[PDB]
Amino acid sequence: QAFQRQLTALIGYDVTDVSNVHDDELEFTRRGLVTPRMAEVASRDPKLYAMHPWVTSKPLPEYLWKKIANNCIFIVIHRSTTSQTIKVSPDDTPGAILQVLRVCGRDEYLVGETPIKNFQWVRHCLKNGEEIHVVLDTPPDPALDEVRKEETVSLWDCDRKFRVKIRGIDIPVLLTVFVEANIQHGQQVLCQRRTSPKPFTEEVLWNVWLEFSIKIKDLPKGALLNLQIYCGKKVQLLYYVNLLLIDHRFLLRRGEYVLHMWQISSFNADKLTSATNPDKENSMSISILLDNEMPNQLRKQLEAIIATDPLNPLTAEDKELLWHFRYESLKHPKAYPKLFSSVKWGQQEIVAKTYQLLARREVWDQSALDVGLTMQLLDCNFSDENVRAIAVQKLESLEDDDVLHYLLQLVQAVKFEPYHDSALARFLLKRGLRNKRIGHFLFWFLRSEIAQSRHYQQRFAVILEAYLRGCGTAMLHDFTQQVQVIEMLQKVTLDIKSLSDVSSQVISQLKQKLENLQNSQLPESFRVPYDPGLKAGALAIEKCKVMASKKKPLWLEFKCADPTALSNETIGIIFKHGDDLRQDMLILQILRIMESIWETESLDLCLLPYGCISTGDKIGMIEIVKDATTIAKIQQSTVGNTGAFKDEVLNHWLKEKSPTEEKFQAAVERFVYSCAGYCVATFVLGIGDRHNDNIMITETGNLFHIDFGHIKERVPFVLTPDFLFVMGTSGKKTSPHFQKFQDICVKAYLALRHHTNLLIILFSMMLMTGMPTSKEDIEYIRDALTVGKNEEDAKKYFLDQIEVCRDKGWTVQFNWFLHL
């Protein structure tokens, strides 16, 4: 039982607790997840698990090939104080041809049957212009990863109409009010019934049967009884709660329920949860009782429909066509979301035909994996397990590198699962247990939601517990260490915040508190949650500070615990309270996806998606990007504390940080690319109009936006005169670098548009699961990606945007200044 107490603290929630359930679905899931855990445990190669090689099968891009010399990769190998360099061909395997080679300063290994060109660490060095420093080391013992040993009427024979008794609602404290009861499947309301309005007192009783038109034999599995409370005095939603009509054992839900409801403040994933509100003492409750072959024009119309984006709404006509031409639609994997949205789920014979249809998915099974298409099947529009499972079926072929690219949003998509035990939850379980890097991030992503989502903490806790019981003792200790450190640091972060430029007493107290944590509480070393390779050590109390800001975040710097670390660079972590860093995580992850897209078209845009992990309610950690300052500061340094800005200061800031001409122009080139990435990426994501104290530049030219979890003459993005002066453009001219900037944006924008469907789905999912949203909010990226339009035309559009900034110059940057 002591092991369970550890799990609870690691998880941040008590999975054995049953104080907020009305059935045993959670416990059933615990027991259900035992098998796929042990299958993965018993199957993983202990030695490859222990070393967790971070590897990709993608080609090395054109931008990384043209950085090689005569098919030669230099790899410095170390012993104790040995440093002997080797000539290696890209195709050389480490655990054979290089003769375990751990990376210097990192928990990262160049091992296994893949060439060195295909290790992400090696590609990381090639990109930045660094060298491959490895250390001959003993392999880490797989015994350390050891895992603690463990231990009657049919539904389709029931033509009776479904009914639910609304006994009444009850609220301790506090105009009229009524109950709406929807049978839902996906976001689709199948059947809706309301009560009569009554006066809104602390108790309202109806004692009324709501008889629905849908038959019990017609309720599809995963149908939700969605109970909602509205008020008049033109109504308004005030509370909601859901109840699965068919439970986890395929039994029709039967009997008395007192469901504690959620309060409002709309596609928001929280609306879909089957979790009841656990705050029984303040929350509105509701009491219920359940006691129960084609023509040519048609082909072209069908093809036009199949070709539209995931946010083009299907008409009744559209759906009827897809459904009638079911089998022709089944030949086109891109049709699948629309076809399955053309299914009348409230009709048992249609669902049966849909299931027949699903048994003929040769073309789907044979199709190359499209993540975009696959993600759409995992969104809120699909509640059927068999549809959703063909989505997860395709995810199974993702190599680990790609799982990590999509992990955050795969974890978020668990929120769209009807049941706690799902093919998706088990896929994430499986892939996390097969790979320590996936498992590490799975821990934190799951934990991020467990700590601040009442709506989904129970589900995620069960999944996280199931992961933890298979990750192996080493990772348990390891995770335990990390949680203890962030709890210590979050405490210091919050305490300093209460004590409010940063005054004398603040700078005094912080450093004492850091010195007090250092001397007793803090461990020898711990893993950096956002960069599991890096192990942090002792604080550099010297270098730690608090921002002259209203949120008063902590800038912390640590020593690297790893003696074999080559640099002297500290590990920098910002701890901040006040911002919802879930939104940042999501945006930063989409920026990583955008980078991998660009990579497929051999385009680098040098984005800087810095590490960020939400650890709790409005709280978390941000990776310190070293040698960087804000653009706003670069203007204040030369111009003044509070004044509007001059065009030359950024370029002449860049100049004064660049030592040689070789490294300066590099900075300017790096900046042209960087500026282009963020102009395209922020435009697409609709977060481009930012005050320049939320844009940053490195000493080596790399522009990057920060502080995403925030967001009248406007601007599509930020391409200010100071950015344009670095390119060399005095108001209305055209430099060589600017035409190249214009060049790069266009190719980047068109590159994103080639994955339009993927981006639309990730943007939709982002809004639904991390931004508490409307259809019109979601439909921004359609316009941003100029859906339906041609290359030439989308290119004009984007150039027109580049010029909108030019027309405005400084007006919005300055209009912020006044506001702020």
For the annotated binding site, the residues are 572-581, 607-615, 704-711
Q: Which is nearer to ligand 3VE, 112 or 709 (CB)?
A: 709
Dihedral of alpha carbons 771, 718, 817, 707, sign = positive
User: Is the Cβ of residue 574 or residue 748 nearer to ligand 3VE in the bound state?
Assistant: 574
N- to C-terminal Cα separation, the chain: 54
Strands 531-539 and 176-185: unpaired
Identify which of residues 276 and 698 has a Cβ nearer to ligand 3VE in the complex.
698
478, 439 Cβ separation under 8 angstroms: no
Q: Find out whether 529 and 621 touch, Cβ atoms under 8 Å.
A: yes
Kindly report the CA angle at 268 between 208 and 11, in degrees rounded to 5? 100
Decide: 101 and 84 in contact? Cβ < 8 Å: no
Smallest gap from residue 553 Cβ to ligand 3VE (A) = 4
Report, in Å, the least distance between residue 531 CB and ligand 3VE.
13
Q: Which is nearer to ligand 3VE, 208 or 507 (CB)?
A: 507
Query: Cα–Cα distance between 167 and 287 in angstroms, integer?
Result: 5
178 versus 645: smaller Cβ distance to ligand 3VE: 645
CB closer to ligand 3VE out of 421 and 579: 579
- Taking alpha carbons only, the member of 618, 443, 452 closest to residue 527 is 443
Minimal distance, residue 690 CB to ligand 3VE, in Å: 12
Backbone φ and ψ of 347, nearest 5°? -135, 115
Q: Which of 79, 110, 78 is nearest to 96 (CA)?
A: 110
Q: How far, in Å, CA of 507 to CA of 513, rounded?
A: 10
CA distance linking residue 162 with residue 139, whole number of Å:
62
Q: Which is nearer to ligand 3VE, 479 or 610 (CB)?
A: 610
Query: What tokens were used for 616?
Result: 């709790």
Q: CB 771 → ligand 3VE: shortest distance, Å? A: 20
Span 525-584, contacts to ligand 3VE by CB under 6 A: 545-547, 553-555, 574
Q: How many whole angstroms separate alpha carbon 98 and alpha carbon 502?
A: 53
- Specify whether the CB–CB gap between 160 and 479 falls below 8 A: no
Q: Are 414 and 220 in contact (CB under 8 A)?
A: no
Provide, rounded to whole angstroms, the least separation between the CB of residue 164 and ligand 3VE.
Answer: 50
CB closer to ligand 3VE, 215 vs 545: 545
Minimum Å gap between C-beta 446 and ligand 3VE is: 23
Binding residues among 689-728 for ligand 3VE as defined by CB under 6 A: 706
Site string for ligand 3VE, 499-528 (x = CB under 6 A): ------------------------------
CA 62 vs CA 66, 120, 414, 463: distances in Å: 6, 16, 37, 40
Shortest distance, position 493 Cβ to ligand 3VE, whole Å: 10
Q: For ligand 3VE, give the closer residue by CB, 206 or 555.
A: 555
- Which of 121, 239, 340, 610 forms a contact with ligand 3VE (CB under 6 A)? 610
Which residue, 363, 371, 378, is CA-closest to 330?
Answer: 363
Can you name the residues that pair with 69 across neighbouring β-strands? 72
DSSP single-letter state for residue 175: -
Closest CA to 590 of 375, 268, 311: 375
Q: What is d(CA 90, CA 74) in angstroms, rounded to the nearest whole number?
A: 10
Shortest Cβ 329–ligand 3VE spacing (Å): 46
CB closer to ligand 3VE out of 378 and 622: 622
Handedness of CA 796, 802, 807, 812 (dihedral sign): positive
Whichever of 504 and 519 has its CB closer to ligand 3VE, that residue is: 504
Question: Whole-angstrom Cα distance, residue 814 to residue 820?
Answer: 10
Copy the structure tokens of residue 447: 């934990």
Our CB check for ligand 3VE shows the closer of 301 and 636 to be 636
In the bound complex, what is the minimum distance in angstroms from residue 492's beta carbon to ligand 3VE? 13
Beta bridge partners of 696: 630, 704
C-alpha separations of 705 from 44, 547, 687, 694 in Å: 40, 18, 10, 6
Q: Can you say which residues are annotated as belonging to the binding site for ATP?
A: 572-581, 607-615, 704-711
Query: Going along 444-570, which residue ranges are E strands?
Result: 526-528, 531-539, 545-546, 554-560
Smallest gap from residue 540 Cβ to ligand 3VE (A): 14
- Torsions phi, psi for 587 (to 5 deg): -65, -40
Which two structure tokens, joined as six digits, stand for 23? 């059935």
Q: How many CA atoms lie within 13 A of 554 on its CB side?
A: 32
- Contact letters for ligand 3VE, residues 738-767 (x by CB under 6 A): ------------------------------
Least Å distance, CB 630 to ligand 3VE, is 5
- What is the closest distance, in whole angstroms, from the C-beta atom of residue 585 to ligand 3VE in the complex? 12
Tokens linked to 227: 């109970």
The footprint of ligand 3VE on residues 612-651 (CB under 6 A) is 622-625, 628-630, 633
For residue 268, the Cα-to-chain-centroid distance in whole angstroms is 15
Q: Which residue lies nearer to ligand 3VE by CB, 22 or 545?
A: 545
Strands 132-136 and 101-103: antiparallel
Say if CB 74 and CB 87 are below 8 A apart. Answer: yes
In the complex, minimum distance from the CB of residue 507 to ligand 3VE, in angstroms, rounded to a whole number: 11
Residue located via tokens 């019934």: 193
Q: How far is the CB of 624 from ligand 3VE (least distance, A)?
A: 4
Cβ proximity to ligand 3VE, 30 vs 577, nearer residue: 577
Closest contact distance (angstroms) between CB of 14 and ligand 3VE is 34
Q: Is 691 helix (H, G, I), strand (E, B) or coil?
A: coil
Closer residue to ligand 3VE (CB): 67 or 710: 710
The closest of 217, 220, 230, 246 to 181, measured between CA atoms, is: 230
What count of residues does the chain have? 820
Do residues 331 and 304 touch, judged by C-beta distance below 8 A? no
**Binding-site size, ligand 3VE (CB under 6 A):** 17
Residues interacting with ligand 3VE, by CB under 6 A?
545-547, 553-555, 574, 610, 622-625, 628-630, 633, 706
